[PDB]
Amino acid sequence: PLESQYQVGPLLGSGGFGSVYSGIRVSDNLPVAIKHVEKDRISDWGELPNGTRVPMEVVLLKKVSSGFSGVIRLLDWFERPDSFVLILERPEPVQDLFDFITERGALQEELARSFFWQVLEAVRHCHNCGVLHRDIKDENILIDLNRGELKLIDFGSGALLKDTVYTDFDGTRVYSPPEWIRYHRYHGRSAAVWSLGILLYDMVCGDIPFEHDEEIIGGQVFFRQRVSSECQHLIRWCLALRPSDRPTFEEIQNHPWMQDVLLPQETAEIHLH
């Protein structure tokens, strides 16, 4: 019985993803987020062990929601006549990374390193679970301000991970790679690495590097802030024009800029508390 298990609080936001409300699980007072998705707005459908027909978003969340990780966990879901309702983890207190960068500007490299490392671990977890997020960006990352933990949200543009070409894309354009702009084709891993270079630039410069198609395919990155030579190197490597010139996750995590990461608790004590 959905409406009696959850006290519905205020609207947290709405858009392409649906409508998300703050909530409290009535039994144990667990903070949750209650996401409503209209059936007309779901193009991508899948099914579970049961062979019951659900939004792809529910398939992907279940695949990643087992064990602890830097992914928002799906706690429950419900079908209504015109909608699905998803019950998600809600960190408290929380700020999305987009708002955090708006308020604080360009992040110190030590904080960007801690955040970028956690996003890499979260994206490895997705890939290891057979899930491609396809919309990695500051707006889809929550900061747990007391634990210093990042959580990935919004799998509504995601797909099962495959080794063959993708010819569909409904993620954020300006985090989309040049091969999509030019050819309407991409491979999952190398396109994820592009979106990670956009995100790292966003953290160390305070905004995304490209606005127009011509900048995305142009192959020049201009630094608007003071950024270390090792950080510029990693970013320009992630943003290689040719997908096969981009680093693997292993090569990113072994990059000299990535060494000596803070633990989440240290990150919260030094930068967040």
Side-chain angles (χ1 to χ4, degrees):
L2 163 55
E3 295 86 341
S4 73
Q5 278 196 59
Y6 299 101
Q7 273 179 0
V8 181
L11 192 61
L12 292 180
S14 77
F17 48 91
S19 296
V20 183
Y21 300 80
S22 193
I24 299 292
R25 192 165 59 188
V26 169
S27 41
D28 61 351
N29 298 309
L30 187 79
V32 295
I34 302 177
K35 177 169 180 180
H36 298 254
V37 192
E38 203 148 347
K39 278 179 197 190
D40 299 17
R41 300 284 173 213
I42 304 159
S43 93
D44 278 39
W45 293 86
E47 90 195 351
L48 303 171
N50 304 301
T52 41
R53 161 171 168 101
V54 294
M56 191 45 45
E57 176 175 5
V58 166
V59 172
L60 301 181
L61 280 163
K62 288 175 82 80
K63 281 167 75 52
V64 295
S65 279
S66 64
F68 297 84
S69 68
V71 180
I72 211 75
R73 297 178 66 198
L74 178 70
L75 300 181
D76 213 356
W77 65 272
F78 302 90
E79 178 171 5
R80 281 175 167 182
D82 302 335
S83 74
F84 284 90
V85 184
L86 277 51
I87 309 312
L88 302 146
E89 169 182 16
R90 173 166 63 86
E92 174 57 20
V94 71
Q95 196 178 23
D96 73 50
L97 178 60
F98 178 93
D99 286 338
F100 186 87
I101 292 163
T102 301
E103 290 185 1
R104 297 189 40 163
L107 308 189
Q108 293 178 12
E109 286 193 27
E110 170 184 85
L111 182 57
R113 176 189 295 113
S114 174
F115 280 7
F116 192 60
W117 181 267
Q118 287 192 50
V119 170
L120 279 158
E121 292 286 322
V123 172
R124 286 183 57 202
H125 171 83
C126 297
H127 289 189
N128 291 338
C129 292
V131 172
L132 190 69
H133 185 287
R134 299 206 292 183
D135 197 23
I136 299 158
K137 56 173 176 174
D138 54 7
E139 305 164 20
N140 287 340
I141 299 167
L142 299 182
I143 309 160
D144 183 327
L145 290 170
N146 283 353
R147 297 175 54 77
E149 287 171 14
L150 292 208
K151 305 283 197 205
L152 200 47
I153 58 161
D154 198 359
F155 288 76
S157 310
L160 298 174
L161 177 68
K162 64 186 195 196
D163 296 325
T164 52
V165 67
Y166 292 86
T167 56
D168 70 294
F169 181 68
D170 161 79
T172 310
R173 183 139 189 110
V174 282
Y175 280 82
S176 80
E179 62 269 27
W180 170 251
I181 301 322
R182 278 159 84 197
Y183 307 123
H184 295 303
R185 293 160 70 78
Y186 61 94
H187 290 76
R189 290 167 190 88
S190 58
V193 167
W194 175 273
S195 76
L196 291 167
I198 298 301
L199 174 70
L200 178 51
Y201 184 99
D202 179 49
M203 287 193 300
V204 296
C205 287
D207 206 13
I208 59 173
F210 310 126
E211 191 160 88
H212 303 123
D213 290 1
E214 297 68 20
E215 302 184 276
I216 297 172
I217 73 199
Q220 296 180 27
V221 180
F222 167 89
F223 284 85
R224 66 193 70 189
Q225 287 279 320
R226 167 59 196 198
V227 173
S228 65
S229 297
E230 301 205 323
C231 186
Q232 292 194 11
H233 176 279
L234 176 54
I235 288 168
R236 283 195 175 103
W237 195 15
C238 292
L239 300 182
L241 282 184
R242 292 209 170 189
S244 63
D245 287 341
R246 295 181 200 142
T248 63
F249 299 147
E250 176 176 41
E251 278 173 325
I252 295 173
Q253 290 192 298
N254 284 332
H255 196 278
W257 186 73
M258 287 279 263
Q259 70 211 343
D260 298 324
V261 67
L262 293 180
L263 307 183
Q265 198 36 244
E266 290 165 346
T267 304
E269 281 169 351
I270 298 161
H271 292 287
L272 303 182
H273 274 172

